[PDB]
Amino acid sequence: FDRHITIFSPEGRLYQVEYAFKAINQGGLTSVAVRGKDCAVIVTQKKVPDKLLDSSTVTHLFKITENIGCVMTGMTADSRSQVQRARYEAANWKYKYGYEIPVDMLCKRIADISQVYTQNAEMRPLGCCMILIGIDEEQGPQVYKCDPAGYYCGFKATAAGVKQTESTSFLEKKVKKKFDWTFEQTVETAITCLSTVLSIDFKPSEIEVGVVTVENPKFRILTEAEIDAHLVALAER
């Protein structure tokens, strides 16, 4: 029965938790987020398969609060369900502890939600993994990722979706050589990471890029005009 409900397998693993990981790749998208010195940037692909489909209503970049950005990789039904509860938990922090929730304590409560789904056989886990960014006034920018199992850890850069190891492999080129991470430079690596693996060369209308900086702590999605300004100038060098 170990492959139906969540219970210990003969080797002590959980197959329902593993299928929750296989439910992430079923979304058909790939996202990347890089933690910079003064900034944190998320880059994901905007998919509009239908011409009648409204582009303004299809967005993969979510706002948990003012200083925290969000992107969801996984089942779309589970993704928008967790973000609503993530906004219920984030507001419960301020109503209780008084200040804007940090990205670390936010990923912890969200991970604890997935822990209840795992231990209990009544409720199934969600097939979506959340990638959260933000800037803490003490340690600076904070970029975290939470899998459906409940694991989260501090990442210098994140990778999710179809491309994972290959996306991280390009990110290893930048961190091992110790490059300089700035607002533009991190956008230089983020666009190049997704473009080389998928062999596309994304257009400004094909993607959406959220950004947060020390000077601009409010999370904001870049406009196609600005993305184009960050495209041809990126393609310039």
């Binding site: 706002k63 948990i64 609060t65 609503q84 906004r87 219920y88 507001a91 301020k94 109503y95």
Partner: protein
């Protein structure tokens, strides 16, 4: 305790005093009774100071959720009905009375008195234990189409008049001008209170 708000063309001016006194003794002579529920949405606290601060957080808890779900600033009418239903339902254990005012992209500056559990729209609204004595000035001296400079003085003159007659009102005048381009916060020191007939 005196709170005042006046609508004009480009926005609203919501004033309040700094005096908070429980009984006949002043707990704090400098306190801000304007608690932001949003960027342009503010709430003027009055009545019981303990119950008003509890509703202000319960209102902010619901408004931040409604604001993040729409990803746009909530309407002033939305924020007023939140305070009203919390007031009307819980009026058994809550004696507080609040005044909701702000600015939105739809109708612009709006001021909604939530006092006693009802809701109505007004061009200018006043509340608190000191608003009862200022009815004379706000009614006669109110003129349509006043400039932002005249609205700041009209709001200040009436609040400074309440501070004289109301024993529970005093301190410094807090002014908040809520417009489409932002909100300006000003503090009027005791020397800058407009002088009226002294005899």
């Amino acid at each position: 305790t005196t709170i005042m708000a006046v609508e004009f063309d480009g926005g609203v001016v919501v004033g309040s005093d700094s005096r908070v006194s429980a009984g006949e003794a002043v707990v704090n002579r400098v306190f801000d009774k304007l608690s932001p529920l949003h960027q342009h949405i503010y709430c003027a606290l009055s009545g019981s100071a303990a119950d008003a601060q509890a509703i202000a957080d319960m209102a902010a808890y619901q408004l931040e959720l409604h604001g993040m779900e729409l990803e746009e600033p909530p309407l002033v009418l939305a924020a007023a009905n939140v305070v009203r239903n919390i007031t009307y339902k819980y009026r058994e254990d809550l004696s507080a009375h609040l005044m909701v005012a702000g600015w939105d992209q739809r109708e612009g500056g709006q001021v909604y008195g939530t006092m006693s559990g009802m809701l109505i729209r007004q061009p200018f609204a006043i509340g608190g234990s000191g608003s009862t004595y200022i009815y004379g000035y706000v009614d006669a001296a109110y003129k349509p189409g006043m400039s932002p400079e005249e609205c700041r003085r009209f709001t200040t003159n009436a609040i400074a008049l309440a501070m004289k007659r109301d024993g529970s009102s005093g301190g410094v005048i807090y002014l908040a001008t809520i417009t489409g381009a932002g909100v300006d916060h000003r503090v009027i020191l005791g020397d800058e209170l407009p002088r009226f007939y002294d005899e």
